């Protein structure tokens, strides 16, 4: 029973830490690819203009 | 069993978020410099 209780303690602590870190990752997410896509359409439009010229 | 299962699931989805964010920073910086150079070229051509 002591083993089970301590294991549950560890499980709860690990769940807390993993959820916290993954939520931090989610918060940091998407800025890079948003700006990346913006730059990509900008460059593609540049290429289209140059080709038309 | 529950601890190991959900910890592994957390590991995979943490790694998924890591993949989603990661190298995109390097690509953003690379195209930042690329637009720097492209704007330099366009400025030079328009000045000419």
Q: Which two tokens stand for residue A48?
A: 């289209």
Per DSSP, the three-state class of A24 is: helix
Question: Which stretches of chain A sit within 8 Å of chain B by CB?
Answer: 7-8, 10-11, 14-15, 18-19, 21-22, 25-26, 28-30, 32-33, 35-36, 39-40, 42-43, 46
Per DSSP, the three-state class of B32 is: helix
The secondary element (H helix, E strand) that includes residue A51 is helix A31-52
Per DSSP, the three-state class of A23 is: helix
User: Do B20 and A28 contact (CB within 8 A), yes or no?
Assistant: no
The alpha helices in B1-48, defined as continuous H runs, are 2-21, 24-47
């Amino acid at each position: 029973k002591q083993k089970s209780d301590e294991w549950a303690k560890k499980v709860e602590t690990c769940r807390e830490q993993l959820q916290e870190e993954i939520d931090r990752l989610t918060v940091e997410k998407e800025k890079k690819q948003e700006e990346l896509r913006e730059l990509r359409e900008r460059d593609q439009k540049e290429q289209e203009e140059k080709d038309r010229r | 069993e529950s601890y190991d299962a959900l910890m592994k699931d957390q590991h995979q989805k943490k790694q998924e978020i890591e993949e989603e964010l990661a190298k995109i920073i390097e690509e953003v910086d690379t195209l930042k410099q690329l637009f720097k150079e492209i704007d330099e070229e366009k400025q030079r051509e328009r000045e000419l």
